[PDB]
Design an enzyme around this catalytic site. Structure first.
Site, PDB file in Angstrom:
ATOM      1  N   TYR A   1      52.865   1.785 -16.024  1.00  0.00           N
ATOM      2  CA  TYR A   1      51.877   1.360 -17.013  1.00  0.00           C
ATOM      3  C   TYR A   1      51.598   2.508 -17.970  1.00  0.00           C
ATOM      4  O   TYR A   1      51.431   2.322 -19.159  1.00  0.00           O
ATOM      5  CB  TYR A   1      50.593   0.941 -16.315  1.00  0.00           C
ATOM      6  CG  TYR A   1      49.853   2.105 -15.741  1.00  0.00           C
ATOM      7  CD1 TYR A   1      48.903   2.778 -16.493  1.00  0.00           C
ATOM      8  CD2 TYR A   1      50.149   2.585 -14.469  1.00  0.00           C
ATOM      9  CE1 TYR A   1      48.264   3.913 -15.997  1.00  0.00           C
ATOM     10  CE2 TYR A   1      49.516   3.717 -13.962  1.00  0.00           C
ATOM     11  CZ  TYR A   1      48.576   4.376 -14.734  1.00  0.00           C
ATOM     12  OH  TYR A   1      47.949   5.500 -14.249  1.00  0.00           O
TER      13      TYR A   1
ATOM     14  N   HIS B   1      40.686   3.057  -6.106  1.00  0.00           N
ATOM     15  CA  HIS B   1      40.489   3.899  -7.270  1.00  0.00           C
ATOM     16  C   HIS B   1      39.053   4.003  -7.760  1.00  0.00           C
ATOM     17  O   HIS B   1      38.643   5.043  -8.284  1.00  0.00           O
ATOM     18  CB  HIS B   1      41.300   3.363  -8.416  1.00  0.00           C
ATOM     19  CG  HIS B   1      41.345   4.273  -9.592  1.00  0.00           C
ATOM     20  ND1 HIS B   1      41.765   5.580  -9.501  1.00  0.00           N
ATOM     21  CD2 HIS B   1      41.101   4.044 -10.901  1.00  0.00           C
ATOM     22  CE1 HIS B   1      41.784   6.116 -10.708  1.00  0.00           C
ATOM     23  NE2 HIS B   1      41.384   5.202 -11.576  1.00  0.00           N
TER      24      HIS B   1
ATOM     25  N   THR C   1      -3.192   0.796  -4.049  1.00  0.00           N
ATOM     26  CA  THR C   1      -3.508   1.813  -3.073  1.00  0.00           C
ATOM     27  C   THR C   1      -4.807   2.520  -3.418  1.00  0.00           C
ATOM     28  O   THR C   1      -5.226   2.501  -4.571  1.00  0.00           O
ATOM     29  CB  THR C   1      -2.376   2.852  -3.042  1.00  0.00           C
ATOM     30  OG1 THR C   1      -2.756   3.974  -2.226  1.00  0.00           O
ATOM     31  CG2 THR C   1      -2.080   3.342  -4.455  1.00  0.00           C
ATOM     32  N   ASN C   2      -5.456   3.117  -2.414  1.00  0.00           N
ATOM     33  CA  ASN C   2      -6.670   3.904  -2.642  1.00  0.00           C
ATOM     34  C   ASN C   2      -6.093   5.304  -2.954  1.00  0.00           C
ATOM     35  O   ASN C   2      -5.740   6.065  -2.065  1.00  0.00           O
ATOM     36  CB  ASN C   2      -7.563   3.920  -1.386  1.00  0.00           C
ATOM     37  CG  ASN C   2      -8.280   2.559  -1.139  1.00  0.00           C
ATOM     38  OD1 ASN C   2      -8.389   1.731  -2.039  1.00  0.00           O
ATOM     39  ND2 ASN C   2      -8.760   2.340   0.091  1.00  0.00           N
TER      40      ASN C   2
ATOM     41  N   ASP D   1      39.232   9.967 -12.640  1.00  0.00           N
ATOM     42  CA  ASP D   1      40.355   9.384 -13.391  1.00  0.00           C
ATOM     43  C   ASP D   1      40.758  10.382 -14.482  1.00  0.00           C
ATOM     44  O   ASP D   1      41.062  11.534 -14.196  1.00  0.00           O
ATOM     45  CB  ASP D   1      39.921   8.040 -13.997  1.00  0.00           C
ATOM     46  CG  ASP D   1      41.091   7.166 -14.441  1.00  0.00           C
ATOM     47  OD1 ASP D   1      41.747   7.471 -15.456  1.00  0.00           O
ATOM     48  OD2 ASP D   1      41.339   6.143 -13.784  1.00  0.00           O
TER      49      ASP D   1
ATOM     50  N   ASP E   1      -1.424  -1.026   6.225  1.00  0.00           N
ATOM     51  CA  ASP E   1      -1.396  -0.417   7.552  1.00  0.00           C
ATOM     52  C   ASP E   1      -2.763  -0.283   8.200  1.00  0.00           C
ATOM     53  O   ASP E   1      -2.870   0.320   9.270  1.00  0.00           O
ATOM     54  CB  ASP E   1      -0.749   0.981   7.481  1.00  0.00           C
ATOM     55  CG  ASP E   1      -1.430   1.926   6.460  1.00  0.00           C
ATOM     56  OD1 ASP E   1      -2.020   1.469   5.448  1.00  0.00           O
ATOM     57  OD2 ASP E   1      -1.358   3.159   6.675  1.00  0.00           O
TER      58      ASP E   1
ATOM     59  N   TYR F   1      46.108   8.417 -23.021  1.00  0.00           N
ATOM     60  CA  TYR F   1      47.435   8.426 -22.433  1.00  0.00           C
ATOM     61  C   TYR F   1      48.492   8.936 -23.418  1.00  0.00           C
ATOM     62  O   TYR F   1      49.524   9.521 -23.033  1.00  0.00           O
ATOM     63  CB  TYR F   1      47.777   7.029 -22.021  1.00  0.00           C
ATOM     64  CG  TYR F   1      46.949   6.531 -20.868  1.00  0.00           C
ATOM     65  CD1 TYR F   1      47.151   7.033 -19.567  1.00  0.00           C
ATOM     66  CD2 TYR F   1      46.000   5.528 -21.046  1.00  0.00           C
ATOM     67  CE1 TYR F   1      46.418   6.535 -18.472  1.00  0.00           C
ATOM     68  CE2 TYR F   1      45.269   5.033 -19.972  1.00  0.00           C
ATOM     69  CZ  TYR F   1      45.482   5.539 -18.697  1.00  0.00           C
ATOM     70  OH  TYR F   1      44.733   5.089 -17.638  1.00  0.00           O
TER      71      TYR F   1
ATOM     72  N   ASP G   1       0.899  -1.167   0.000  1.00  0.00           N
ATOM     73  CA  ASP G   1       0.000   0.000   0.000  1.00  0.00           C
ATOM     74  C   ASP G   1       0.937   1.216   0.000  1.00  0.00           C
ATOM     75  O   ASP G   1       2.156   1.090  -0.110  1.00  0.00           O
ATOM     76  CB  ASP G   1      -0.890   0.001   1.275  1.00  0.00           C
ATOM     77  CG  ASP G   1      -1.838   1.238   1.383  1.00  0.00           C
ATOM     78  OD1 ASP G   1      -2.534   1.568   0.394  1.00  0.00           O
ATOM     79  OD2 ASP G   1      -1.900   1.872   2.476  1.00  0.00           O
TER      80      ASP G   1
END
Lengths: 541, 487
Positions: B324, B466, B66-67, B276, B128, B408, B6
């Site tokens: 690298y 990283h 739901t209403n 990065d 509820d 790079y 609900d």
């Protein structure tokens, strides 16, 4: 040939240089005391560092204030002790805007086919209101092929090398180029190089005069800037397994979805998209289900207005947008009114062009209501699958030239008799001369868009009369309380103004607009007027 | 199986004749006061919403019966957001004022079952009110009464489904259930992106070797936080143009094309937030095109301008941890290694700051391959799923790796270009978020930053490597929002 424009002074006014003279007087200092920094020839100190982009704006503020404190009281007139060029300079900057008749003149020579551009002594604005500049730059962006900004390439006028770099960029001689500027001292070297010099003294006019005096002439009232089409961002949302809507996007928040009608496309709003973006809104000119680049399924049940409206909500949910202002036309106009009626939460506002809000009666079969109005004949012709598709598709060129013509033009469509003579393009020549409201180019775009969809999908819109009726009846006890606008086209054969008179029984507070000498294709026939109206409404409410 | 909820007071809190039918749908709201705000001053119940996305992730049909009622209110956007937001976590929405029916009218339930396509058994319902629940247990379906603020609720609810956590991750958007944009910036080149939320604009730019999908945890949260997100695929990646020329990835040219991406899109200013490599670009956008930058944020990547008296390659050749970076400098070489088997490549790259199998950033050249020291069969990081890994695989089968690596390869010219603005300062709003355990791009590399960027605000995340966004999403989200709200 090529035409280039300085910005401060010919494309943008009032010259910021203006506010320099203004406060010059505003303080009792010697002619050209503060302007020498900006308008010189021999530029030194921080202003040269600026316009060559070695330092940003902010940096230049303090440093120049001090170059002023020197020069200042210390060599002539008393420059106030506590004094700064910061808020004055950053204001005549934000307090300046586009010179339309001038931008107008440029769009021309470009439409005409000329290499256009801007050569200006710029600077990097890390200012508190640098936004004003980004917009101006954003919007001018579209109309010039090149933009040589002093502060990016490291040269400044009249320093000779900038000009030589312009020529190397346009790849041309000093003859085939015309140069517009507000200083003249900045123009001394162009002539000297064998270039055309036009001092943009005035605000244009006297300058656009000595301008037609070479190349061509400019409209009295030019038609607005049409947005189009490889220059645009294309979006794609998948609302349900097989179905996905395509749209075009321009401008920044809040959201406003333009929905087109039969038999058109997003490209129909071409004249409102730019103008609308520039007016401060995030435009979403969508391709309705069954059209152009969105999913065009074959099932008829697939175009039920209830299902079509539900899928507009989903298009927002997936896109993250929680509310938009929907503005439709023709068939979309209907949908739009039903969005307002069924999903108010998601509707900031609604506008309709030509199409009135015409709810149904629960004691009057819906087909009967169509069968009576003599002017919804074609609507019936359409009710049968394969039939109208076959006619419209046989030769798409006639089909479009036939459909899109001005309220004051011949070759019209057969809305009244269609079913007797069997067709709408029946009495239509099979070589319509081209409307004055569209170009071959524009026609071609529609042709190509429909080679992908055919016409079934679009027509399936007319084919859900029953259920549509049954669905809408669900909200006959409600009223449309969200903001609404109704714009009526005078000479619109079907969807005549008079069909709206009762509307406020459902929509009190309904605002209204009306365009004269206008047919069904409002957007394409009276764009500027539509634009004017639409903006005022969006601004006002 | 199914789970129904609900809203009157279960997925939204605080809770809430002619009225008897506002629910059904004949009259609107406005056509009917110190209660409208009682609608506005209410929001989502996250532990309850969490539980639901759980079962959905867990493979359940989920929903809301739901209403309802139609809000033509003046403050009706509250409901729009709540609804718009909840939208993505439920497959069906049985709202009363839409189908003409209202609990406990027994027909709505027969309507839910129909839609769903199932029996009252495989279906648990949550309400509820309890008096609006009698019918459902009466029908043969599992009822649960929300009394607490989810607690004992989600518990007997877990005693039935399974186990939801308590400190959950922020929900991830994903990857066809979103709008895809496409802009053509230059003849052959066109950028692709994803969009969510409404104005003002904020462009998320990713780094090597990722995609827009990397920001998957920030996109929703950010949209919901009031912004129009544009998580872009950087040049050379995923669904955007990935040309082969190296000169094509020069940062100067890359920055120019971000401006164009705004101009074509009509947007005049956005807040750029990179990570990065994008982080670098972003800092250069702030430095070169201030007009278009509402603000800038960087994750891990400091603003490291160059020295005009220090060859840029020399600066890379010195730092032992940018090995690298050198390995990458040769065309075809790293491409070949990374592409050989994309599954290892990704599991290798994406692992948490507290995990093994790492990458060879130091010894790369020497041992001749940034993956050589990696388990040939990486076990799967705890930071990503096969599913997530697969998306990256597919995205790179379209680009290969040349395009990304060409980033790079523009050291020289990049150096020569950036030197142009060594006399400037970054005066637009800025944020620097540092990741503690980030091997390359260590916090310490930012200490000097304010010499260029005074007023630079700052944030910092602990136990983080990283992959900040993917490793500490919620924390990144928290930080990012406060900054956007504050400035």
């Amino acid at each position: 040939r090529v035409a280039a424009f300085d910005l401060d002074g010919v494309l943008a006014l009032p010259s910021i240089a203006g506010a320099f003279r203004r406060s010059e007087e505003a303080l009792a200092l010697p002619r050209d005391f503060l302007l020498g920094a900006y308008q010189t020839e021999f530029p030194e100190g921080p202003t040269e560092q600026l316009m060559k982009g070695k330092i940003t704006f902010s940096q230049w503020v303090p440093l120049m204030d001090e170059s002023y404190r020197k020069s200042s009281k210390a060599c002539g007139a008393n420059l106030p002790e506590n004094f700064s060029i910061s808020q004055i300079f950053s204001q005549a900057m934000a307090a300046r805007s586009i010179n339309r008749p001038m931008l107008q003149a440029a769009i021309a020579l470009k439409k005409k086919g000329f290499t256009t551009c801007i050569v200006t002594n710029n600077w990097l604005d890390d200012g508190d209101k640098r936004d004003s500049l980004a917009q101006m730059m954003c919007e001018l962006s579209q109309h010039f092929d090149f933009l040589i900004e002093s502060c990016q390439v490291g040269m400044i006028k009249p320093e000779p090398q900038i000009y030589n770099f312009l020529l190397d960029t346009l790849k041309a001689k000093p003859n085939e180029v015309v140069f517009l500027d507000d200083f003249g001292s900045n123009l001394k070297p162009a002539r000297d190089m064998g270039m055309v010099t036009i001092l943009v003294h005035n605000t244009a006019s006297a300058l656009r005069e000595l301008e037609k005096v070479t190349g061509t002439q400019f409209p009295e009232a030019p038609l607005p800037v049409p947005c189009n089409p490889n220059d645009v961002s294309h979006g794609y949302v998948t609302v349900k397994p097989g179905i996905r809507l395509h749209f075009v996007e321009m401008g920044s928040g809040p959201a406003l979805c333009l929905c087109h009608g039969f038999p058109e496309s997003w490209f129909s709003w071409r004249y409102q998209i730019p103008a609308l973006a520039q007016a401060g809104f995030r435009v979403l000119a969508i391709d309705m289900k069954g059209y152009g680049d969105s999913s065009s399924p074959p099932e008829i049940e697939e175009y039920a207005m209830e299902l079509l409206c539900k899928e507009m909500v989903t298009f927002l949910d997936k896109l993250g947008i929680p509310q938009a202002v929907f503005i439709g036309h023709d068939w979309a106009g209907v949908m739009v009114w039903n969005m307002a009626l069924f999903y108010p939460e998601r509707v900031r506002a609604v506008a309709s062009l030509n199409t009135p809000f015409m709810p149904p009666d629960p004691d009057v079969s819906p087909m009967k209501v169509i069968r009576s109005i003599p002017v919804f004949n074609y609507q019936l012709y359409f009710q049968e699958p394969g039939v109208a598709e076959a006619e419209l598709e046989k030769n798409m060129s006639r089909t479009f030239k036939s459909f899109f013509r001005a309220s004051d033009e011949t070759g019209f469509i057969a809305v009244h008799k269609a079913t007797e003579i069997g067709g709408i393009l029946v009495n239509t020549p099979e070589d319509p001369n081209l409307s004055k409201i569209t170009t071959e180019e524009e026609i071609e775009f529609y042709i190509q868009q429909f080679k992908k969809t055919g016409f079934r999908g679009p027509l399936n819109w007319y084919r859900n009369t029953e259920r549509n009726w049954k669905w809408s009846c669900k909200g006959l006890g409600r009223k449309i309380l969200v903001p609404a606008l109704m714009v009526t086209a005078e000479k619109d054969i079907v969807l005549r103004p008079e069909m709206s008179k009762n509307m406020e029984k459902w929509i009190p507070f309904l605002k209204r607009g009306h365009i004269e000498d206008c047919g069904h294709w409002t957007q394409i026939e009276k764009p500027t007027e539509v634009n004017q109206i639409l903006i005022k409404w969006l601004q006002t409410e």
